Amino acid sequence: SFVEMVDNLRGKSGQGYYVEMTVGSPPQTLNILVDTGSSNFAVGAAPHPFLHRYYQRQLSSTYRDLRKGVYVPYKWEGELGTDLVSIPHGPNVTVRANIAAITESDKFFINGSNWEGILGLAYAEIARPDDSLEPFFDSLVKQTHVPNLFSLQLCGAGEVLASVGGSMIIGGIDHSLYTGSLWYTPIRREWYYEVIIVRVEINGQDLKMDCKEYNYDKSIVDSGTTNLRLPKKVFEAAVKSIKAASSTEKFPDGFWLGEQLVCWQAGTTPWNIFPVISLYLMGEVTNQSFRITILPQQYLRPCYKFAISQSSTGTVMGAVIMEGFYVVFDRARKRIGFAVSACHVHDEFRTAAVEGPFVTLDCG
Template structure:
């Protein structure tokens, strides 16, 4: 009996410790999901942690692939704002109703329960993945990329948290990837930190500035294949010195192309998405490296997102990828993320059927790069094996090695002979003022004051007549906000 209790204790201890350490989980290709509690009484839902959008949006209807959704009628604390909102993503769209309700995240004990805006999705197209274990997403970006609707500003969960705590908050993602080569489930951790705690974190040696506070838009300067220890790529010839005009011109051509539309850090996107021509160059080098190592993989894997499968897990000997990011410390400095092949040769299926009669083991992989037209997106493939700290108010993202996941590295800083902001034609970093719901509220307040002043001016003659000739009480009219809206609508 004692031994049984002891075993039970250790199992419980290990389970509890694991739950405390990691609160993000997901299946292959489906990003990282977090469990949240919504409404009173509480309904538990899983939402993707998405730095590429702003709104907390959850399903409010049953779908073909899932019967789990938020039942609005069961929440006594829900308030229906009565506005229709919508959002469009790089993949998928949805339409929904805007409400407000209480949200609590039990794995973030430092964050209080808050009442915030929620979009209840009523209709969607290519938004929910088949068999996905999540029912919505938690947007962690800035207000300008939130859902939109007519005459409505959709607030974010993060803004509501900052308002409740009366202080600016940062957050950190530690994405660990899969637990082993025989398991396709990935895991990680989301932490919330106040800015005082962030300022004491001396591990954040490398910071890149947020150039625009919409998405987390940063300066991606170069994507290079590391061959034989040299970070070179055929667009930048290895025999060119860093100070030569030819090198500067080649570097400029690359970084301008990478940032032509936008370059963002997006945990809601799986792959590293590159402008079409750069995607082709990176993939061609990786393909040649695989051929040199006698790894036979068909073109469909490299260029069309198809899976490649083997009867046993693969230990990849391909070269790593170097991603240069603009440094926040000086505009002629950059640092480099070194991303190993374990990141971008992504496990999508891990079926170990050894020992079972008549069945075959299957381990399938997909390439973690894709063509993105003119935009650059560092999806979670570029973040696994690292800790990424998003300081929203100060306007920078910090990168440093993690104690879990692939052996990604951060190296530098490296100096350039000229300003990278100028060379790469980048936007100047935004000032250290958070773009939040408060800005929208002050804007609406200013508009209301101006409208009230105009109204008083227009009604002044009527008021003067009323003073001179008082009307009977029964004929007084209401100038409530609802009445004014109704008059404007007609």
């Protein structure tokens, strides 16, 4: 019953979405960041100023040491083992999955985020230390009859950082979580959830870039990133066009650089002066595509912060993109489906949209 997985996600704005999980025996409860942008199940397993709980291996009778360390600079560092894992508000199963017990970390955990580890939902290829460390979801599917698919409805928010909600439906698709058609873009390669963007428009205006620029050096769907991150050249074109469209009103370039906040007080926000952004993703059919269209309500995250930023690692469709939609990670069919979310934030003139198909007469 997917009903029981509805709203199994919580988080603070900008600090990611976590699901409750239990690890070990007896079950040690922990909040775990849902991260489609990485592939390790990595959990705090030692005291840290930002941790109010951590995984305690010695407390777990079903813990098994893999006698292998793992080091991840970017840092976090830990020791590998296995243990029984469940998601109380997920499939009614328990699996023995790999766990990176994090023993020391620098700028890994986030103060006040309220999660104690990360669930890397991406593929073995980018797992640490290497691809022999089977990711959680692979273990889950292999050990249970849970379908090789999961879907994410991230709803955002709509003194303290705003609380966000969402659902991670494991093993299938919840038709109540979206309206309209699910449109699928292929997973170009199974490492990150890599996809191809073939075109992008700001208020119907084509940036008119060689589509390779959109996926330079790659495009991924990443719940573990807050912003829509864009390659340098695409970002600059995007910002230019967004500045223009919202020319009435003038903001400090500190705002466009996404470090500064802009404020109206209150309920006065001129949404209508900010353009929609349409990302066209490659269709399942060669020369087809569909667009996902997001509002300023998504890319201006709450007083607001510009949630579009520059990337040196390709396009990252982070939370603020996914928050418009119900996103199906159809691992079984190597594709990602998008549908307008039952929870996406919109006003009485615009709405996030998934629309297709659109056609073309090499974008990777």
